[PDB]
């Protein structure tokens, strides 16, 4: 009975789970876009989002510093978190991460795959799904309705 369990079991145990996410996160902060097992990426996303929040607490905060010290494994990144990533998220509260499902891995294990990304990175943009345009027949029919909600008010 799994009721209300938020964290999925990975690795060799709870600790191995933390270290798996450690590596994933470090990879994410370095390269800013990575791809991995859909489940693991999903699991990661929360952490990846909170790390930016500790980053916003600034260099001088001790808690944030040893936090970043534990999570970012290659130490050289710790400045990047504080002096690059954390600044470029200022206005936005929670919007840091984009996560999409990629087609299943071509290897024989055929896994379920996801790409995860920090917004505002400098890379060729992911081919996101576009909503239909407004010129589409159905949407036009709705535009009619809208303008008649404006005309009747």
């Amino acid at each position: 009975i799994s009721h209300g369990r938020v964290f999925r079991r990975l690795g060799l145990g709870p600790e191995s789970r933390i270290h798996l996410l450690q590596n994933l996160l470090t990879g994410l902060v370095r390269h800013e876009r990575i791809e991995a097992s859909w489940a693991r990426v999903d699991e990661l996303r929360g952490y990846a989002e909170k790390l930016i929040d500790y980053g916003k607490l600034g260099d001088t905060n001790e808690r944030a510093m040893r936090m970043a010290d534990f999570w970012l494994t290659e130490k050289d990144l710790i400045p990047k978190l504080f002096q690059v990533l954390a600044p470029r998220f200022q206005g936005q509260n929670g919007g840091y991460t984009r996560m999409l499902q990629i087609p299943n891995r071509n290897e024989q294990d055929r896994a379920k795959m996801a790409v995860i990304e920090y917004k505002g990175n400098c890379l060729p943009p992911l081919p996101l799904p576009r909503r239909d345009s407004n010129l589409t027949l159905l949407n036009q029919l709705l535009q009619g309705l809208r303008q008649d909600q404006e005309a009747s008010s």
């Binding site: 370095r30 390269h31 876009r33 290659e74 130490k75 050289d76 990144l77 400045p79 990047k80 002096q83 690059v84 470029r88 999409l100 499902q101 990629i102 087609p103 790409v115 400098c122 890379l123 060729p124 943009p125 992911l126 081919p127 799904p129 576009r130």
Partner: protein, 110 residues
């Protein structure tokens, strides 16, 4: 526990041709507006994502060449440029990667 009798072919056909063991037809397949290959509706297009992946690889390669070693990563934002381009005033003060290829149609300048 060992089977008491050989299961006949009729019984067996009943088991393995049963509806629940058949592959189920996927109805969510569609065409990518871009390249006109196939994709499932809730998933990124494989072909397009390959374009992006290759280019990303090349960029990362060339930004590994600008870093003399494993542990040097910039303390500044970076921006990637293509043949016949120059850094904007807004984009200066940043790390600059210069690629030979002309800027791809899907990739915007931003």
């Amino acid at each position: 526990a060992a089977p008491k009798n050989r299961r006949s072919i009729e019984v067996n056909r009943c088991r393995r041709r049963n509806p629940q063991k058949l592959i189920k037809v996927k109805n969510n397949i569609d065409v990518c507006p871009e390249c006109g290959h196939l994709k499932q509706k809730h998933i990124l297009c494989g072909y397009c994502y390959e374009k992006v992946r290759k280019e990303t690889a090349e960029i990362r390669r060339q930004m590994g060449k600008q870093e003399g070693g494993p542990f040097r990563a910039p303390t500044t934002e970076t921006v990637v440029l293509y043949s016949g381009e120059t850094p904007s005033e807004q984009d200066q003060g940043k790390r600059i990667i210069e690629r030979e290829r002309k800027r791809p149609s899907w990739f915007t300048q931003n």
